[PDB]
Design a protein around this ligand. Structure first.
Ligand code: HEC
Length: 108
């Protein structure tokens, strides 16, 4: 199906009230609870510096796409976390679309 993008243009504030709990997108920002996400799309599944998490499912030599990330940002946990905690849907569908886009443009 289509991916929609920059609709509410709240994504960057959604992040601040969703992801900021656990992560940053600042330039090599602090690995607060999970790692920083700077250029996470243009990286792979967790070639984060520093934060040597377990991330077996994550790794599976995977790339991060707006889709793949949106899925990881959609389902309430279940994505084999182990590590600790995943949360899923921000609150709405269009929010996820917004978020992914903003966090795309933020660092890709
Ligand atoms: C703390 C409760 C978290 C919240 C809220 C968010 N994330 Fe997260 N993320 C968290 C952990 C512990 C992990 C490792 C695997 C697991 O589910 O336990 C992750 C993983 C990611 C990843 C992939 C691997 C990485 O290098 O980080 C990404 C790309 C990611 N998380 C993004 C992300 C975003 C954008 C969030 C806000 C919507 C977000 N996470 C919330 C813990 C937590």
């Amino acid at each position: 199906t289509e991916f929609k993008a920059g609709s509410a243009k709240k994504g960057a504030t959604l992040f601040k009230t969703r992801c900021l709990q656990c992560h940053t997108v600042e330039k090599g920002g602090p690995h607060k609870v999970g790692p920083n996400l700077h250029g996470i799309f243009g990286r792979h599944s967790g070639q984060a510096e520093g934060y040597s998490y377990t991330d077996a499912n994550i790794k599976k030599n995977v790339l991060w796409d707006e889709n793949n990330m949106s899925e990881y940002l959609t389902n309430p946990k279940k994505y084999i976390p182990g590590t600790k905690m995943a949360f899923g849907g921000l609150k709405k569908e269009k929010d996820r679309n917004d978020l992914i886009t903003y966090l795309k443009k933020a660092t890709e």
